[PDB]
């Protein structure tokens, strides 16, 4: 089977990339360093940015369940690629440290 192209990222609750898996180079064409420290919304099509902000806001309310969102991500070649980001929060209950958001980001088709 043809394997999906995807990469993992960690974000703070605001959406800033705090960790980026190197599989991002093949998925969207950027080096991890080009994403780290930026908000995911900075790579998102203007029509999708608010949905993406809403999603990050809601995943924290959903009790560690998975949220997904589909949006247009600007690749390194300045082309809009459809991405499906599936996100969930992680909080270590030995602590009261703030949860962060774990994402898996896959290039998908906007079609049936």
């Amino acid at each position: 089977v043809c394997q999906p192209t995807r990469f993992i990222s960690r974000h703070n609750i605001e959406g800033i990339f705090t960790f980026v898996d190197h599989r991002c180079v093949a998925t969207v064409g950027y080096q991890p360093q080009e994403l780290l420290g930026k908000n995911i919304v900075e790579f998102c099509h203007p029509e999708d940015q608010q949905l993406l902000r809403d999603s990050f806001q809601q995943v924290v309310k959903l009790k560690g369940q998975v949220l997904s969102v589909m949006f247009r991500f600007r690749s390194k070649n300045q082309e809009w690629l459809w991405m499906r980001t599936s996100s969930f929060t992680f909080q270590n209950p030995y602590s009261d440290e703030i949860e962060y958001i774990i994402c898996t980001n896959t290039n998908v088709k906007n079609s049936s």
Partner: protein, 109 residues
């Protein structure tokens, strides 16, 4: 003494439980290089006394979509075992399993 993040590593698995990705943090904790884990099933690494319970947890994960593992022992690269606990999540397109792994002990030989 270590902080929380230094004892946490994320792994990704295909639905056959084989590693498809692992955080480099695992090297400092357990000894493995991520590249050497790829294509090996999670089951290769569980202590014998935890194997039946882990099978049940994997079954619960696949049935329900998420699971918390309880405490189990993972085989360390240079012998011995480390206690850890895992939160597992299936990502459905099922595409893969994400595991957040937290180390609970030093390596015990």
């Amino acid at each position: 003494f270590k902080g929380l993040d230094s004892k946490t590593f994320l792994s990704e698995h295909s639905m056959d439980m084989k590693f498809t990705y692992c955080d480099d943090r695992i090297t400092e904790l357990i000894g493995y290089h991520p590249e050497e884990l790829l294509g090996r099933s999670a089951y290769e690494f569980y202590h014998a006394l935890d194997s039946e319970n882990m099978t049940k947890s994997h079954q619960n994960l696949c049935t329900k979509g998420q699971v918390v593992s309880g405490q189990y022992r993972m085989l360390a690269k240079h012998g011995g075992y480390v206690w850890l606990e895992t939160q597992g999540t299936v990502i459905y397109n099922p595409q893969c399993i994400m595991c957040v792994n937290y180390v609970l002990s030093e390596i015990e030989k």
